Design a protein around this ligand. Structure first.
Ligand SMILES: [Zn+2]
Ligand SMILES: [Zn+2]
Ligand SMILES: [Zn+2]
Lengths: 156, 96, 96, 83, 73
């Protein structure tokens, strides 16, 4: 918890939750390969219980949910992949937010299994649909909406 | 699972029913939730009368036509039958 | 069982109570003082939102109740560009 | 007994997959083995389970080479190599 | 009805269940891979282990269940 409250970030904006989610996180060639395998659902669940910023994005804009859907091994460790998508959504990660390239994690799922899991765990809301329609039609939303909703249009 | 947006001047009622059913129970439920005599229900689809015994699936809307995302309007002018005076929704402002 | 939603521009909308309790703000409005326990009207007066956005949020209520959990066949919500940026603030107010 | 023999044959089926998985693991740890050397090693590695009959292992051997998981060498039938 | 108790055989919602090469499930490892992987799907809704698919395409360009030319995803 003390380390999370500093919000540590790598070169490419990766928070401590993103690296525990990303499969590209390096593992040392020594005995750490036998234990520390990423993504790990226990690490993500412990970090979310300790108060990790689940909606935090990197420099590219990908959230914690944007990297877990990009996992290229959906069935080999499906027990890990299922137990981490549920944890992120239950923590409060948006299932509709977009990165700087304006890509939904459904669009960046690149996998039938991850898309199925996410769509099962999506909680549909009118605010997300309206914000997606606003962003799709490129409507001028500056100074016409509450300031607490400008960010909402920003990532949706 | 047909979905209807019953209109009467300004009042609007959203109702769920089945494809193959009569409008008898539809008139009865709108009577129950409107607190009006049950003899003034004259349902109108696209400003025309319809039979009170014919199924509503053949009346002009179905599952592919009437949806929860976009229900079909059904005027419900009451006998004082009054003329159809369905007030349209307010137009959105002219976007730049 | 049925609640009433009144827009700023005189329009009245009636939807099922379970359909309208999916938004937190309407649930808060129905709770507290002035429940008006007639079990048929429970009328809430929205003094700000226009009629078209209220119609769209009622359609959203029905749409979400129908598709709260289903198969992959989830049809998209038909949001017009003109009704957006006014339904977004409406959903913010309603906490939909 | 109509369904008891099904569980007496399901164990026979799972015997074949466990025998085939045993030969792949044993041979590729050495990359080459004789016929008698592999047969004794298959039995010794499956003592905490069924006692495998000699006819079943050689039946799993001839299936395995046909599946191109292992290959019989060019010397004789008493020389097996991985592939 | 008064009272009813049943049993449910819950399984994961993946459409494909087992690799029909090694007669093994897809959740665990293949026979080539156990001794010490990724899953390869097909255009004809045929999903197997990566090592099993590699060996099968090394044998012939025919899908393991039907006479169809194997393709990647
Ligand atoms: Zn493998
Ligand atoms: Zn396999
Ligand atoms: Zn195939």
């Amino acid at each position: 918890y003390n380390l999370i409250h500093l919000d540590p970030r790598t070169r490419e904006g990766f928070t401590l939750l993103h690296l525990a989610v990303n499969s590209n996180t390096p593992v040392d060639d020594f005995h750490t390969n036998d234990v520390c395998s990423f993504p790990n659902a226990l690490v993500t669940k412990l970090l979310l219980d300790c108060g990790a910023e689940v909606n935090a994005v990197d420099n590219e804009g990908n959230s914690a949910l944007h990297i877990i859907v990009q996992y290229n091994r959906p069935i080999s460790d499906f027990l890990t992949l299922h137990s981490i998508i549920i944890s992120l959504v239950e923590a409060g990660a948006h299932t509709d937010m977009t990165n700087k390239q304006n890509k939904t994690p459904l669009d960046k799922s690149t996998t039938g299994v991850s898309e199925i899991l996410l769509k099962t765990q999506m909680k549909m809301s009118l605010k997300c649909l309206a914000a997606r329609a606003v962003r799709a039609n490129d409507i001028n939303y500056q100074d016409q909406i509450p300031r607490t909703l400008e960010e909402f249009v920003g990532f949706h | 699972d047909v979905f209807l947006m019953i209109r009467r001047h300004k009042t609007t009622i959203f109702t769920d029913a089945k494809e193959s059913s009569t409008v008898f129970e539809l008139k009865r439920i709108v009577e129950g939730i409107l607190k009006r005599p049950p003899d003034e229900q004259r349902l109108y689809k696209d400003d025309q009368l319809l039979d009170d015994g014919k199924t509503l699936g053949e009346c002009g809307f179905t599952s592919q036509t009437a949806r929860p995302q976009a229900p079909a309007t059904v005027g419900l002018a009451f006998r004082a039958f009054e003329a159809l005076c369905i007030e349209p929704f307010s137009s959105p402002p002219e976007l730049p | 069982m049925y609640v009433k939603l009144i827009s700023s521009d005189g329009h009245e909308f009636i939807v099922k109570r379970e359909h309208a309790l999916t938004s937190g703000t309407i649930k808060a409005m129905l709770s507290g003082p002035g429940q008006f326990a007639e079990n048929e009207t429970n009328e809430v007066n929205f003094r700000e939102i226009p009629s078209h956005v209220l119609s769209k949020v009622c359609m959203y209520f029905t749409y979400k109740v129908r598709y709260t959990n289903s198969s992959t066949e989830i049809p998209e919500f038909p949001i017009a560009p003109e009704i957006a940026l006014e339904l977004l603030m409406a959903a913010n107010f309603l906490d939909c | 007994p109509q369904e008891m023999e099904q569980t007496r044959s399901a164990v026979d089926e799972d015997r074949k997959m466990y025998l085939q998985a045993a030969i792949v693991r044993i041979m590729k740890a050495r990359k080459v083995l004789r016929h008698n050397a592999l047969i004794q090693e298959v039995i010794s590695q499956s003592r905490a389970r069924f006692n495998p009959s000699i006819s079943m292992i050689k039946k799993c051997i001839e299936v395995l080479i046909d599946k191109q998981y292992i290959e019989r060498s060019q010397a004789s039938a008493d020389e097996y190599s991985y592939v | 009805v008064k009272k009813w108790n049943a049993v449910a055989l819950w399984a994961w919602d993946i459409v494909v269940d087992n690799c029909a090469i090694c007669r093994n499930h897809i959740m665990d490892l293949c026979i080539e891979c156990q001794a010490n992987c990724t899953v390869a799907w097909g255009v004809c809704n045929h999903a197997f282990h990566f090592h099993c698919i590699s060996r099968w395409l090394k044998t012939r360009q025919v899908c393991p269940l039907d006479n169809r030319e194997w393709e990647f995803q």
